[PDB]
Design a protein around this nucleic acid. Structure first.
Lengths: 80, 84
DNA sequence: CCTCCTAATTAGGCCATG
DNA sequence: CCATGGCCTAATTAGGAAG
């Protein structure tokens, strides 16, 4: 097919494409976080919130409280 | 050269090789974070802590306070410095 | 601590499905 | 409706090893 197209760095107006891009890139960066974490053994935290009010997150042991602790969850919710 | 190599998902014992990977991977995931954020217009928060203790971070407008505030910064500090 | 040669690896449309 | 999930290719991204 046309292969991967060089998308211009800008907000995708087409709701369809925007959402489609989100799911893919969301999964991508999530794996990247996992990889960086395990490979170098460094503490990583990732939080992504979709328009659909979904909060996809990834956190390392010592950083989990940021999203798990009531205190952290509160801050997160406040920011959103 | 040989090209890119299939790195087995595990802790890189070779400290120098490890940090080399970290430097690239880090800047890469940071780029991704920016791209996803600006592209889809969604809120993103990234936090990466090196062995050296450096806390490299990135966050979208709404999430900035998470890393730039007494409450936010404190929480980050507590986690990193609390027993495991 | 922050380029080169290449292969590993994401994604982009697009359509399909839970 | 929304979120993935392949398919087919092409744009990136990191190893390894040096600058």
């Amino acid at each position: 097919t046309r292969g991967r197209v060089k998308i211009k760095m800008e907000f995708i107006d087409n709701k369809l494409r925007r959402y489609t891009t989100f799911s893919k890139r969301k999964t991508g960066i999530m794996k990247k976080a996992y990889e960086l974490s395990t490979l170098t053994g460094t503490q990583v935290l990732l939080l992504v919130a979709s328009e659909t009010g979904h909060v996809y997150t990834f956190a390392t042991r010592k950083l989990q409280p940021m999203i798990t602790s009531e205190t952290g969850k509160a801050l997160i919710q406040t920011c959103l």
